[PDB]
Every structure is written in C-alpha cells, then in structure tokens.
Amino acid sequence: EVKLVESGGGLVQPGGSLSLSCAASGFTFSDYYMTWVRQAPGKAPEWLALIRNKRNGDTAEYSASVKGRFTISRDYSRSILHLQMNALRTEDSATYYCVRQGRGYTLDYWGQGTSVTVSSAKTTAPSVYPLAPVGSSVTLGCLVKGYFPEPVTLTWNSGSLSSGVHTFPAVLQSGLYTLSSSVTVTSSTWPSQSITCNVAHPASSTKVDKKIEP
C-alpha cells in the first residue's frame, strides 16, 4: 500500500520558518513526481508545489502564494520529500499534505497531513475536566480547556470505547481553545465499568487521563 507520512508541523510565530518532511513507502519513489498541497479548515485544498524526478532535473513548480518563500526538494536515499517554509504568516495556517502525482496528471494518494499553526499565541497545555451526570442510557463528557495550539487527540478508554462518541471541533476564544466530547453508554455499563477521557496534546508533550466518577 502507498503510504505518505508527513512530519515537522507545529506552531510557529509570524515571520518564522518551518521544514516539513514526508516519508514515502509502498511505491517506486523515483518514478513519481511529488507535490505539497495544503487545506485550511472549511476551505478547498490549495496546491503549493510540485517536484519532478531525475530525468527532468528534479525541477519544480510553485503557486504564486508561496513562490520565493517555500522550497520543495526530495531525497532519493531515504524516499523523503521536503518543504522549507519561510516568512510565514497567519494565513499560512493549515493542514499540509504530501501528495503523489500519478499517471494522467492526477493527485492520487494523499498523506494524513501535518498541522501548521502560525500565531503569536503561546503553547499552553490543556486542563481536562470530567463531566459526570447531574434511565436506560447515560451520557458522560470531557471538557478540554485552556490550550494552544490545536490539535489535541481525545479518546475514551485509550481508544477501546469508540461507539456513541461525539468529539466536537475545537473553538478558539482569546487565544485558547476549548474542545469537548460526549460518550453515551447503557446505564448498566457505567459506573460499574470504568470510563476514562484521554487527551493527548503533542505541542505540550502532555497525555492527560481523567476517569469520570459519580
């Protein structure tokens, strides 16, 4: 299976720089032109750069929005695609994707993406608050406040509890995000069995577990 794994994203101040990397596997890397495409939330994807392969000199093309500020490159020794980003602005915040061009000028396989936030707001770890109820089924929750930047990853029982969950998009207020999640189970499931909110925040290298108690 074709796989593209981006890394290097994170929070950077306006005016700063970042270097993204993309590890390719599952195809002959040298046979494909490669690209970077980004997507801001609720906007269409925006293509940023393409690099050809050795026959064409590893030559490249850029969108006007990044030409002169971003540089695409590729390392055949490790099958890694890179994007160096300079002079970043708040409008440069998005999920960045490593994307292969296949035959016929199609962008055929996209990575998972790496999140980039350009902001002068500082990294802060989240507070995680358990939300226990005040017949039949019961809804419990987890409130995550006080953090920056996105993303957090929220699971229930370390990912073992995935049904009945609603994890709400994070909302920004005054430089701090709030996120929440509800989980609905049978009243015979809880409190007799343990239900715990886990919140990972890579930007602060924090993983918080909060058991919901009566």
Partner: protein
Amino acid sequence: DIQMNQSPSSLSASLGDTISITCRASQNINIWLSWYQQKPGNVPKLLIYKASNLHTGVPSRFSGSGSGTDFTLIISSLQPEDIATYYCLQGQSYPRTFGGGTKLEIKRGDAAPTVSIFPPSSEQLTSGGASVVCFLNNFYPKDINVKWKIDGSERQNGVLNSWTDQDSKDSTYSMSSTLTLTKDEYERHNSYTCEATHKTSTSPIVKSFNR
C-alpha cells in the same frame, strides 16, 4: 491561471437518489480532470481520474464524464457514507487548481436532540473556573439554537458553541454549548439551564440543575 468553478456549492439529497455535480474550467483542460471525496475529518481521496476513469477501490456507483471545459460527477444510489465535500482538480496547467467544492448533505427525517447538562467539575472549581456544558445530540435538521439562563435570566457572554459535521451512519448532527463563569460568579446563583430551539418542538427543550 485556470479557474475551476464547481456547482452547486451545497446539495441536500435523499438516500437512494442519483446526484449530479458539475465542474467547469475557464480554459480547455482536455481530459486532465480528477474528482475527490473528502469525508468529514478525513483527507481527500481520489474517485475519478482522466475525467472518466474509476480509481481502484471506488464503488462503481461513481462515474465521471466531460472533456474540454465541462465535467460531471455522478453518484448513483446515495448511501449515508457518501456525506462529504467533493472537489475537482485540473492537471492541464500550473498552477494546479481545485474547484471550490460541493458539500453533500443527506436528507433524513426529523430527530429531536438528546440534551444533557453538566455542572462544573470539582477539579475546575478548585482552579477557579466554572463551566456548565450542555450536549444536544443526534438531531436533524442541523438548524438549532441554544439559549442559556441563570436564575431565569438570559446569559449570552461567555458561551462557546461547537457543532459536528453530519454523522455518516445516522445522518444526524450534534452540538456542544459551554457557558464559562468565574467560580465566584457561579456561586452567586442557583438555577442553570440550557434551552434548545429546534424544528422538532414548538417550545424550547430545556435542561436545568440547581447549584
């Protein structure tokens, strides 16, 4: 630069319906036109390349047609999993350009929200804040409003709302509403209530607790 214009920008259709989405290029692009589906929270995935060719693994319910400037994606027999934004992409010229997308929403019967209210956690109060949370879950249509009241009075400031995208299994929507106060402001009042206005009731559904 080649502008890709997609139509309609949003569509609501019934399960089992045939739908038809359009992409028009501002210049000839021959057959270099691909279509993508992006399910909520997911990355874009290729459906059709070279205008009309089905990508490996993409249900035969999807098909594409067109050449030159005007292209169409058909989805036969709409399934709940098809909730997504669809985008086209031209690969004729640089810069590579995408259409602005068509957001697909699935029609379904009305469903009232299941509403749950949560007083501040003792951890939060220890640290000095007091958030009260209401979840309004699994409802349809998407249109909803929430009103907070403290001892019977409308509170507006301090409220943070978030909504999920459409659920790909039951085609419902959910919302969370968090009212944040100081611990001291919270302790000056007793009654906390959230009220949801929705199609499914002529009067607000309310949930309440008394500190």
